[PDB]
Ligand binder design. Structure first.
Ligand SMILES: [Mg+2]
Ligand SMILES: [Mg+2]
Lengths: 118, 57, 67, 233, 102
RNA sequence: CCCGGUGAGGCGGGGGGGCGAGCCGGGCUCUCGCUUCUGGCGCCAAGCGCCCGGCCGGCCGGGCGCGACCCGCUCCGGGG
RNA sequence: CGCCGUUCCGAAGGGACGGGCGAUGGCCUCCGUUGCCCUCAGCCGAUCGAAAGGGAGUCGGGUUCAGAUCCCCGAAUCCG
């Protein structure tokens, strides 16, 4: 009716949500970072054995794109174990190493036997 | 304390139990209470004189 | 036969009628941006004899070039 | 009985004093460029000198005449698409076992009719843009002796022919039951447009300053005429 | 020959103003209804030093006549003004040092 | 066409009101538009009028108008 | 090819307390969500720009061939 400000502003107008006639992609893309992809193989070095025996920690080489949440979910699902925390460093050769500490009720040396590490 | 530390302090530590407390010093709050009251009184006085001269006019 | 009169009318650019229309329209064109979508041909007779047709898929643009 | 707690608390809106009220500022708004451009084009037409060939289109039918003219024309509207399909289907039924009069739309159709003297009344919209499409038509209709009138709205002529817009329409024939209605229109229209043509084409438009300027001129003259009046006292 | 120093000054580059620590542009109030028909009151909050300028600047605060706001203006300090002083601007301010009149 | 300012915020004209003047209570030359003592406060309406609704003339809740004059063609100024 | 320009010729806000309407839900009691409408909104310049500027919050003991305020033991803390 009346303008109590000297400024004109673009009036707000309806914005409809997208309703595609067809999907631009026939099917969704397959998850290429599944549990099997995340965990490459276990590390069996001398420093890795020490972690198993003394820190209740498993030492895995993982995909460089994995994060600590995904690694934890992968280790639990693959081996039906529990994880206390996951530490990660990217090695000078470009591989990501995961220091997976298991829950206190899980014996890492026992679990390593299941995984075949030892 | 540093400004972001003020977020985790209770309110009692960041102010004073008085009008403007934590924002204006007591000395200047005294001056404002008088200044507000005394100027408002002056308005009434001039209003009566202005009204009187209007009556006398 | 209206397109004939318009063609002949636009040949009298120094007439009083045309001078008024060119003057005001140049003023209006000068208040817009250098490239400007136009809603319809300013000159329906001239546009069509240059190949334009009044159907979807033909669009008009007004361009301002420095002299 | 009134509650004594209620009282007047008037605001003093003088310079200084209280903040100003949110009064109507429509006159001082900064409007979008396109609003300024279309408004400034309306003042230029008033401000400048509009040649008679264009200015004539400002003279238009009064509302009473246009309503009668549009009521009569509404009896001769061209058939819609939906009902032309019906006529063809009925023509098939009539086949398996005269053209009524109608309006004529468009400056191209109407111009050719006017040159052939096949039009009895031509109606021209007053706001065709570009004006070249019709700026010549009034001068043509007078030359051929066709009565013509200028009506408000190329969109009101649009509603006649079921289109957004129409530059001009023309009566070529009417049913015998309407000849009297057309006859009265033609006689009223002709005296306003065809007969005054000598004066229409010598009548420029615009050339009117703005109210602030006019008031400034008047106030200056009002200082001399008063000075003149007090010359004798 | 090569471009002389005077020519090189107009290109900016190393010849632009040292405005890192300048307090702002010094201006009067934008003229509005209050100054056109009456006057408006302000208060000198501080008189400050502006780098690169000999004259001090005054920081005068007004009320916004249409909004609940305080307007901070940066004036050129007239000699003799002081903090806490009242200055007035408009067609009907009095003739006193620091006032702003047509 | 150009320049300046603004968050383009009260511009032009008229109405309405006030102090003065002076022609014989009214008209008009003609003026003004409510802030100058103090380093306070100051918005998101009070009030008045008119209608509407809900529950049971009483309670509860809305809308509108004045308050905040009317009409105007360039935002207001400066050039041109 | 592009350059200038950074608020300058721009309809530059996609936000919200609250109020009114519907549609949906669930620990269907009443609360949420969602869509529309009413109302309110300066910021006025996208974005980038510092491993020495600004910037919440971790310390002690042990431990390796090579890593530790990062691992282990212990005791804290900030933010959400
Ligand atoms: Mg305290
Ligand atoms: Mg840094």
């Amino acid at each position: 009716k009346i303008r109590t400000s000297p400024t004109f502003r673009r009036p707000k107008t309806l914005r409809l949500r997208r309703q595609p006639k067809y999907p631009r992609k026939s099917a969704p893309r397959r998850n290429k970072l599944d549990h099997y992809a995340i965990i490459k193989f276990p590390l069996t070095t001398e420093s890795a054995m020490k972690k198993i025996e003394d820190n209740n920690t498993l030492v895995f080489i993982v995909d460089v794109k994995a994060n600590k949440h995904q690694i934890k979910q992968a280790v639990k699902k693959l081996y039906d174990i529990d994880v206390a925390k996951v530490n990660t460093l990217i090695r000078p050769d470009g591989e990501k190493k995961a220091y997976v500490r298991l829950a206190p009720d899980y014996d890492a040396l026992d679990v390593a036997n299941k995984i075949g590490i030892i | 304390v540093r400004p972001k530390v003020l977020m985790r302090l209770s309110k009692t530590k960041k102010h004073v139990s008085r009008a403007y407390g934590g924002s204006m010093c007591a000395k200047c709050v005294r001056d404002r209470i008088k200044r507000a009251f005394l100027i408002e009184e002056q308005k009434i006085v001039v209003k009566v004189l202005k009204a009187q001269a209007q009556s006398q006019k | 036969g209206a397109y004939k009169y318009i063609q002949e009318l636009w040949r009298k650019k120094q007439s009083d009628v045309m001078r008024f229309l060119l003057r005001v329209r140049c003023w209006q064109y000068r208040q817009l941006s250098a490239l400007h979508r136009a809603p319809r041909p300013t000159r329906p007779d001239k546009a069509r004899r240059l190949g334009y047709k009044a159907k979807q898929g033909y669009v008009i643009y007004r361009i301002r070039v420095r002299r | 009985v009134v509650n004594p707690l209620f009282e007047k608390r008037p605001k003093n809106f003088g310079i200084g004093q209280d903040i100003q009220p949110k009064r109507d500022l429509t006159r001082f708004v900064k409007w979008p460029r396109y609003i300024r451009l279309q408004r400034q084009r309306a003042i230029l037409y008033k401000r400048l000198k509009v040649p008679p060939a264009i200015n004539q289109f400002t003279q238009v039918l009064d509302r009473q005449t246009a309503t009668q003219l549009l009521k009569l024309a509404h009896k001769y509207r061209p058939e819609t698409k939906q009902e032309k399909k019906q006529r063809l289907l009925a023509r098939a039924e009539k086949k398996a076992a005269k053209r009524p009069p109608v309006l004529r739309a468009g400056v191209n159709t109407v111009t050719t009719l006017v040159e052939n003297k096949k039009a009895q009344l031509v109606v021209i919209a007053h706001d065709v843009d570009p004006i070249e499409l019709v700026v010549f038509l009034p001068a043509l209709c007078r030359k051929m002796g066709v009565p013509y009138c200028i009506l408000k709205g190329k969109a009101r002529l649009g509603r006649l022919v079921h289109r957004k817009t129409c530059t001009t329409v023309a009566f070529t024939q009417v049913n015998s039951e309407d000849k009297g209605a057309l006859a009265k229109l033609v006689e009223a229209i002709r005296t306003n447009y065809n007969d005054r043509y000598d004066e229409i084409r010598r009548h420029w438009g615009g050339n009117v300053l703005g109210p602030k300027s006019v008031a400034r001129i008047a106030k200056l003259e009002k200082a001399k005429a008063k000075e003149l009046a007090t010359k004798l006292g | 020959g090569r471009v002389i120093r005077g020519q090189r000054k107009g290109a900016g580059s190393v010849f632009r103003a040292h405005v890192k620590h300048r307090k702002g542009a010094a201006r009067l109030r934008a003229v509005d209804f209050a100054e056109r028909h009456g006057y408006i009151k302000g208060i000198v909050k501080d008189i400050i030093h502006d780098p690169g300028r000999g004259a001090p600047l005054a920081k005068v605060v007004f009320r916004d006549p249409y909004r609940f706001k305080k307007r901070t203006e940066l004036f050129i300090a007239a000699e003799g003004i002081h903090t806490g002083q009242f200055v007035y601007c408009g067609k009907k301010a009095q003739l006193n040092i620091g006032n702003v009149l047509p």
